[PDB]
Design a protein around this nucleic acid. Structure first.
Lengths: 49, 64, 75
RNA sequence: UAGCUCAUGUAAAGGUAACGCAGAGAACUGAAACAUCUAAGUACCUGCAGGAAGAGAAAGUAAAAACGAUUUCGUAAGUAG
RNA sequence: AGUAGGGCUGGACACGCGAAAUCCAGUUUGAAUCCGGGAGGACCAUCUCCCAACCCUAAAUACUCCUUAGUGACCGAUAG
RNA sequence: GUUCGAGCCCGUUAAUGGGUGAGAGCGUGCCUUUUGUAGAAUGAACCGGCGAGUUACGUUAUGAUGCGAGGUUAAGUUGAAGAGACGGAGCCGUAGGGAAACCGAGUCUGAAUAGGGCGACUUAGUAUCAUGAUGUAGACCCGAAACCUAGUGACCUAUCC
RNA sequence: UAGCGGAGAAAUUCCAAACGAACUGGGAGAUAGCUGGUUCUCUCCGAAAUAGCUUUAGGGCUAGCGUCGAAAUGUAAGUGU
RNA sequence: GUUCGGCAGUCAGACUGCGAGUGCUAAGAUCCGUAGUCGAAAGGGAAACAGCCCAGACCAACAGCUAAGGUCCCAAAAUAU
RNA sequence: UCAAUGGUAGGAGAGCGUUCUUAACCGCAAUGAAGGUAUACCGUGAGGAGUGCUGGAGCGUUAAGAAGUGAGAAUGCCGGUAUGAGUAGCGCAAGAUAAGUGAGAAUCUUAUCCACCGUAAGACUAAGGUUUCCAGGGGAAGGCUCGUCCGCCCUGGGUUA
RNA sequence: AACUGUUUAUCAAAAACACAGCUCUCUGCUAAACCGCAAGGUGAUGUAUAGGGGGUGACGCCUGCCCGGUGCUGGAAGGU
RNA sequence: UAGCGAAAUUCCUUGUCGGGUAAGUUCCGACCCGCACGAAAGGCGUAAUGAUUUGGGCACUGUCUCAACGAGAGACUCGGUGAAAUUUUAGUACCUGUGAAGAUGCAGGUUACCCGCGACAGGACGGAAAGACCCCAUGGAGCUUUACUGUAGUUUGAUAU
RNA sequence: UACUACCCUUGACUUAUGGUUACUCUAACCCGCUGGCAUAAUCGGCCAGGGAGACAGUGUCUGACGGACAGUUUGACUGGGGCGGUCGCCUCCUAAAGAGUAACGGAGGCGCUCAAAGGUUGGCUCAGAUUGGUUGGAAAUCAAUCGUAGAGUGUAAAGGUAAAAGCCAGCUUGACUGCGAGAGCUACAACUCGAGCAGGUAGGAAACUAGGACUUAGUGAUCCGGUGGUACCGCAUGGAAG
């Protein structure tokens, strides 16, 4: 509430539409590969197992 | 129940981890005649949010 | 009426450092819409016609030309 | 034929704790006022039902092999919008 | 089969007519029908799925005037 | 009213006792509001009883504990409305940059690999509890004139028969 | 003849010891930048009454002004002279 | 002192000088800057006094010394020089 | 030892007291619980017990948890009691004496005079009232005072087409 | 102010209202107008001397000017 | 335009003059400078009619010069009966000052045996009336309009009938 | 330019026909029309005629007016309130010798121009005073003398202003792009600049300068809809829509 004045966010431009086909991969470090050795066929089975 | 996130406020803002928020520039939409040549050179980009202000973050822009 | 609710918005005019300080390269020296002081080495006159530095160092005053001046002496 | 008469069948009219469904349906509010919105299709009112009601068997979802009527709860998550 | 649809006016669907899906109304027009038809958020092709426009469907759910069996870090006569 | 105290009377949670009190010094009740009320600013007859900052869910902060890049079971099931045990569905952190395509310990911006921008550099949280504040709930209460719906009403009175 | 109404030789007159919008129940503990009220004991620290904006001026939102905690102490900044 | 984190309230004050403005260089008048004071700070002084001056109260105490200001009586100190 | 301790809105910390707590711990209680009352103790405070007395059933400890949880004050509320104040009023009209009645008579009953109304303040009759009528008995309240009287109260009858 | 009437009971009785009167306007009938969603009904078993609305308020005299604007009515050339 | 004009209309101003009147802003009659008369929002007249409004006079006259008298009811004395509003409690004086800028309660000073009783009103900013005057509320109602949005209703055209 | 004409502009008429205006009919519909039926019965229904008539009315959209009736609107200051005025931004005083600034205090304004008044290079110095000279004036012009700006600086005021920011010529389109260290100003939003670099430029021989004007008024938040580009997404899938 800017005292009846429009707010900080109320003065903002409308920026950037959003991809409905946004998709990522749950990215891990290589520091967990430092944990597990070798875990042949490093995969999702090695990841969630 | 839950605390409702204002989705259009989320369309106003974008904050960073371990840091502040990115605020796009004012004035930059409607007329461009009287705003200067230098202001056209520089006001496409924009700076960050305040420090002592904006503490009315809480918690109207929750967890987006 | 008065026709005098007509207003002026004053603003900051005068000095910033004024005494030999290690003022940053490209930093503000003296606000001037009208030049009382007059420039020197490592000192630019602004688009706002102020004096702005160029290279750090002592920023003492000089009575060159029978006139008031600022350069920046280094170190 | 209308119409009239007789006979037979509580049928069924009616009373209803609360829940339901369906129709009819506001305002006050709040939005710092307010005409958009909200409040809520909620307050009320009427009808139709039972022990529950609706509910339901893809003229479905989804997007790759992806399942296979509904229903309730948690989640997704105030996520998409 | 006046059925889908199409026009207009509505409404619901998160959906405030919007790119608007999709469904249901009034009103108007009106199919195809198995080589079919529909959906895949305007829409045109390929693919996926389904077969409406006929009817019924327990169960898991909602709430107690009620019937007791009762339970209380309920309450003690301005309380309850 | 104190404080001192003439004087009097009495003897105690046994105590440098109490009940007084002349006299004498100095002394503008209490509440809300205000800049300032002693008030001729309010308000209070008195006495007793009642009588007002919660919790539901959520977020944030601070601690407490537990384990730790691993913490965490929700709903549910079991069971005494037990507990425990089951239940990992999901959720948090564990890199971000940019609207996005995307790229990635770099990323975007920009002809730039120039600069700048955010970034690991910039070093642990998770879960529960508890406390404060938060937000939806009448949400610290007491408070109108109001608005609409449903219903009642012509014996007062006005009209009419 | 009943309230979004009625009646009315009409004033805004009355509609049951009574009306410019009746009375009763529900919405709904309507709302109220305005009034009042707030209850156990201590210690420590300790205000403002201003700027800027505002359908704002008897109110809010920052900033100045307190308090506590934490991270170091811009390697002293602070504050004097 | 900075930084970070919670948590506040304060918006409207006066008054005394001092320097301004407006006003009849009227005002216990307004409106600034500037210091104090109160507010939110007792006691003493000026007859009572929120604002002036002095002096900042943890408490006991039948201690003294002192600030301003007083020393003919109330009412204490000087019929002081 | 030194330094600090005016303090409102403000903020931080800490503690008291009430009640329920199955918890335990662990007692009291008829030789007297609780509660009340006086009390000339203690505790920085809130607060705590001792004794005397009422009183005759639950209460206290500790420690911790949980709270409809700490009472003046609002036209606060409810209930009681003031106050004014023995003052206003005693509700639009005149009775009077003697005798009875009783226990107690102004106010009840009788006698005897007076008086008033008398297009009514008569009688009779709608609505209404719903037994108030009458008889007998009584006087807790009511009667605006008294009161044997009564539309008051108990009992009993009383309305016929 | 004609009058009588009526008028705020819980203030005000009047010059206020009303009233005959006078004026204009609307309505040819399943009226107009009105009430009700409609239905139904009033208007009124009424038919323009009637019904509705507006003004003014007996009687006497008189009601002057201006169609620019507004409204109303009527007309249609064109614009919309 | 007619017609009326200090109008229920002129504050213009006690307009002017004359009459009523000794004394005459009001009253009447004319004048008519008509801020701002005025024609169906009728204008000017108009007997009778008025709980009209004024201005004058007659009549009668305790209204008043200037009062006084008696009759009844309260009042008041007592017996019976017996409330209301009301408020921090208060054994509540005066002056002059002071002060949220007007004292009972404060400073200085004055007078005052203690307690009443009958009448009275200056205070106690007396009560009773959270001002009905003014102002404010992003307060609400009601009313008005060529505010804006609408709604019904009215009237086109399309189109199934 | 005769055969077959694939034929074309204006008319005409057979046919397809269509909105098409007017009239007629009547089976629709209606008739608070007639008369009859039960009904004894004026409402209704039916019959049998008459009248009207495809109109009316009804539905759904559309246009008209529309206080008949609702729902909201109607600022802020203020020396009570109201009237008036004012509400933005720049300049000077008030400002108290940093800034900071109070009042419905003073003074002004601006709500622009300029492809050249902008950049650059290269030159020049003003206003005014006095003299003297035909038209003659107070100045037109001229020449001379004096002349620190007593002018000008596109536009008010302030500051600044001669190595000129004043004045005139040539080049001239830097009033470039991408930036931007570093700063200042301070609730925020904003705002004031800006070293230097890159990409090339533009003058200027080169050096050097150049991201508007002597600096300061000349300007407004987000939305929403345009304009163009767009390696972006493009809802299974491509495209398209968006």
């Amino acid at each position: 509430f800017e005292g009846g004045q429009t707010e900080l966010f109320r003065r903002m431009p409308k920026r950037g539409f959003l991809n409905v086909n946004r998709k990522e991969y749950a990215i891990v470090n290589l520091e967990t590969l430092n944990r597990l050795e070798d875990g042949a066929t490093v995969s999702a089975e090695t990841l969630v197992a | 129940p839950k605390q409702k996130t204002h989705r259009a406020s989320a369309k106003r803002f974008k904050r960073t981890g371990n840091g502040g928020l990115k605020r796009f520039r004012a004035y930059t939409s409607h007329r461009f005649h009287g705003k200067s040549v230098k202001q056209r050179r520089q006001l496409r980009k924009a700076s960050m949010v305040s420090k002592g202000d904006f503490k009315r973050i809480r918690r109207m822009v929750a967890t987006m | 009426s008065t026709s005098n609710g007509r207003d002026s918005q004053a603003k900051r005019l005068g000095a910033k450092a004024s005494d030999g300080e290690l003022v940053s390269g490209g930093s503000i020296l003296f606000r001037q819409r009208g030049t009382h002081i007059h420039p020197g080495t490592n000192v630019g006159r602004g688009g706002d016609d102020t004096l702005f530095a160029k290279i750090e160092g002592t920023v003492k005053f000089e009575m060159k030309r029978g006139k008031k001046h600022v350069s920046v002496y280094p170190v």
